[PDB]
Amino acid sequence: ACLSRIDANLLQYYEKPEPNNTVDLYVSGSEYSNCLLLSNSEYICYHFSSRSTLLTFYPLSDAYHGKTINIHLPNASMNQRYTLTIQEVEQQLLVNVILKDGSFLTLQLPLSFLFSSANTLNGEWFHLQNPYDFTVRVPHFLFYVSPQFSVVFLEDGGLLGLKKVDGVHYEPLLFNDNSYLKSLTRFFSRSSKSDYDSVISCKLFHERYLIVLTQNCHLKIWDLTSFTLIQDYDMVSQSDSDPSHFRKVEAVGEYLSLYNNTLVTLLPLENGLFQMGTLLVLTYTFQNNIPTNLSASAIWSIVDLVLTRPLELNVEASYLNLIVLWKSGTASKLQILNVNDESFKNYEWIESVNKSLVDLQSEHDLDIVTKTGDVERGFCNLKSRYGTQIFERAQQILSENKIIMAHNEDEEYLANLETILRDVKTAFNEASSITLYGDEIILVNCFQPYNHSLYKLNTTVENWFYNMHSETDGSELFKYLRTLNGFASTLSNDVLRSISKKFLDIITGELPDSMTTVEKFTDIFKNCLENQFEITNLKILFDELNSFDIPVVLNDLINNQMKPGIFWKKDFISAIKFDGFTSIISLESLHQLLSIHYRITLQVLLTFVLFDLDTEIFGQHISTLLDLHYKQFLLLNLYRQDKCLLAEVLLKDSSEFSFGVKFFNYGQLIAYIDSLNSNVYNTENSFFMTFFRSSHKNIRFFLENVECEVQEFMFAMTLFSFDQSYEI
C-alpha cells in the first residue's frame, strides 16, 4: 500500500452544517457526484440526488462561504445521471437532461452566477423540448460530443443523433442500423425483453470517432463523418472462451477510458479483465488482457476508472497508469495498475489504504491521545472528531429511532452515538467517482455533499507505518521499527498512555530536572512497565535489537526521516484567497504524519527506558526524541481539541503563505506537509497561545507541559480563566 486515505469534510471547521448562502432554483444529492474543472481554475462539484430530481452545485475550494445551488427538476431523468450531461461551453455550465416523460431539458448556468453572491438568475436558464418520441423507443444513455452535437443511445440498441441548429432546438439525425436483422434468426426477437445489446460505455476519439462498448462486450466503432458502423470487435473471443458464464453487462457503467491512443476496457470474468489495445490510423489492435487481483470471491464493482500519464511510484519502470476505484457496499478500494513498457504484458498492481488513519485508530483502539473520562468529554471528543454535519445527522437518526439521552451521564447513549457516527460517516463517504485534482492528484467524490476523499502518496516513513505486517524486505531502519512495534503492540493503551505522560513529565519538570536520566527512566519503569509485559516478548525484542547498528539507524531516523528540511522556499504556490479544501487536506495530512511520528518516537523512547543504553552516548538523541514526542503530543492534542483554530494559527504562522497554498502534484503536497512539520518541530507556540486566549482544558496539560517569567504569567492568567493562579 503506497497510498493513504485523507478524508475531507469541507464544512468541518464551521459550526453550521450548511452554507448560509444556498439558493434553490426551480424548473417548470446522494446518488451521484463529481467534480469538473472550469476556465477559472476552480473546481465545481455537483451531485445528482437519489431520485434524480435534484442537481446540486458547489465550489470545491469555498464550500462554506461560497454558493451552493440546488436546481429542482419537474421529474426524474430517464435513466439517472446516465441521461445527464454537464459541460462548460462558453463561460457557462451547459447541462442537458433527458427526463422520464421524454422531454429534453437544457440548463444554462452562467459561470459568473456560480461564483456570485446573487440569489437570483436572469434570462432563459432552462429550455424544455420534445425532439423525439421516447415513449415508443426508450433511451438510457446520453453522450456529449460537441456544443451542438451529441448522440443518444437506446435500450433496444439503436443510436439517435441530436443536432443543434440555432441555439436551442435539437433534431434527430438517425444512424444506419442493420444490427436489428439478427431478429431473423431463431435466437433473437425484436419483441423480446432480452436480446438487446445496448451500449454500456462510450468515448469520443479525435472528435470524429465514437467508440462504444455493448452489453455483450462488443466494441463497435462509429465514424461520425460517415455516420456508419466502421468497426465491430468481439472483445471476448480473444481470451479463454468460457462457455460457462460471461456476464453480459446489465447496466451502464464506467467500463472503459482512453488516454492518447491507448484504450482499456473492463470485461467481466469473475469481474476481472482489463483489456487494453491501441487505436490507430480506424483500427483497434489488441495487446494483452490484464486480470485483476481481487479475492474474497471478487465482489467489487467498478465505480470509476481513469487511464492517464504515469505517477511518481516506487517503481521507475512505468509507461502508463490506470487508476481504478472499486466498491463493495459502502466500503471502497482504490488501486493503480502500473504498466511498465509499451508492451502491455509487464505490469504491477499497487494497492492503497482504504480507511483514513483517524478511522483505523478509532476501530483498532490505537488512539492514545484523545482525552478520556467524562461522558461530556466523550461528547466533545466525538463532536470535534466527526464534524457538525455528521454529528447532527447522527443525532437526527437517534431521535427518529426514539433513542433519547436519559441524563448527563447516560453511557448507554454515548455507546449508540459511537456506532451511528461511524455509520453516518461511512454512508456519507460512499464512493461515486474519481477526479484528477491538479495534474496528478487522486480525488474521490462521495455520496454526501461536502464529502471528498483524497488519496495521498505515502512518504517513506508512512510506507513503513502502513506496511509493518507485510514488507518482505525493507531497509535496516524498517526492520528495526518493525521489531520495536512488535514489542510495543503487546502493551495495552493505558500503559502506553502512562508512559507518554511520563515523557511529558520529563520536559515539564514534574519529573525534576534534578534527577539523572537513568533515575527518571527507572521511575518510569517501576511506575508504568514493571509487571505490565511478557518477559518472553522482552527477550524476543532484545535478541532482534542486537542485530542492528543502533547509532546509525537512529541517526538516519532522527536526522533524515523525521527531522524535515531547511527550505529556501521550494514553490508552494501561494494562495491569493482562502482555499478551504487545501486547508483541511493539509491539516489532515499533517495529522496523519505526526501521529505516525508520535507512535515511532514513543516506541523508541520506550526502548530507551527498558535497556541499559548509555545515557551519555545517546544523550543527544534521547533529548531530541523527548523534545519531538512532546511537540507531537501537543499538536495532536490541539488537533482534536479545535481543528479550525489549529488550522488558523498554523497558516497564519507562515507569513508569505498566510492565506493558504495550492498544490498541483504529489511532490508539492508532500513538500508542503513536510514544511508544516518543520514549523511544528521548530514563535508558533506564542502566536497560537495568543490567538487561543483572544480549548480551556487542554491548555492545562499544555500550561503544565508547554509552559516548561513569561511562562509564569501565562500559567497565572490561564489558571485564572484560583489558588494556584494567585500563588504563582
From Swiss-Prot:
Q: How does it sit in the membrane?
A: Peripheral membrane protein
Which organism encodes this protein? Saccharomyces cerevisiae (strain ATCC 204508 / S288c)
Tell me the protein's name: Nucleoporin NUP120
Which GO terms of type biological process are on file? double-strand break repair; mRNA export from nucleus; mRNA export from nucleus in response to heat stress; negative regulation of transcription by RNA polymerase II; nuclear pore localization; nucleocytoplasmic transport; positive regulation of DNA-templated transcription; positive regulation of transcription by RNA polymerase II
Q: What is the annotated localization of this protein?
A: Nucleus, Nuclear pore complex; Nucleus membrane
Q: What is the lineage of its organism?
A: Eukaryota, Fungi, Dikarya, Ascomycota, Saccharomycotina
Q: In the UniProt record, which is one GO cellular component term?
A: nuclear pore outer ring
Which keywords has UniProt assigned to this entry?
Coiled coil, Membrane, mRNA transport, Nuclear pore complex, Nucleus, Phosphoprotein, Protein transport, Translocation, Transport
List every stretch annotated Leucine-zipper 1: 107-128
How does this chain assemble?
Answer: Component of the nuclear pore complex (NPC). NPC constitutes the exclusive means of nucleocytoplasmic transport. NPCs allow the passive diffusion of ions and small molecules and the active, nuclear transport receptor-mediated bidirectional transport of macromolecules such as proteins, RNAs, ribonucleoparticles (RNPs), and ribosomal subunits across the nuclear envelope. Due to its 8-fold rotational symmetry, all subunits are present with 8 copies or multiples thereof.
Gene from which this protein is expressed: NUP120
